[PDB]
């Protein structure tokens, strides 16, 4: 779908 | 008539203030347990040099199957020397970092970097193996590495005029 949305392999720290 | 000054203005203050709090986040530690860092936020602003596009890839995204380049940033906060790797969200972010980046040691502050840590699923699916070609998962350490998206801003310093503002301003 998005290259960091869901089915990334890197998730943003929060 | 507000004037487009003011964009470039308003970027200037911005720039400099994240860049003082996140600098002090990053020497003070990325988040301490549960958000207890110094200023816990999912974006930064810092100052750093270009040092080189390293030849390999990411695998950022699993269903589309897309890398994105490596954009080695490395710098000293405060005692410490964070070296990580800047990337870049679409192919749009990429093309345009890498013809920004064609000055070598390019000193430049990166605006609104979103560091992403990397991870995945972990159940297995034990099922529909079929698909499988004889490869079994080498052991990867989970880094992480400091995206720049379409929000970002890469500020060139020509001169060390801006440099000197921040660095003087911060202190370390």
Known sequence: QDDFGDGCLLQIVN | MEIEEDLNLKILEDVKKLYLQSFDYIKNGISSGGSGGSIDLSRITFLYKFISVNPTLLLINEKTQAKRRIFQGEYLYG????????????????????????????????????????????????????????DLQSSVDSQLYYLIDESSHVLEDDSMDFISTLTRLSDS
């Open chain 2, 79 to 134: 005692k410490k020397k964070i070296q990580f790797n800047i990337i870049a969200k679409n192919l749009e972010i990429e093309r345009e970092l890498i013809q920004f980046f064609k000055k070598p040691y390019q000193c430049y502050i990166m605006h609104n970097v979103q560091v992403f840590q990397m991870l995945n699923k972990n159940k297995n699916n034990n099922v529909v193996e079929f698909m499988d070609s004889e």
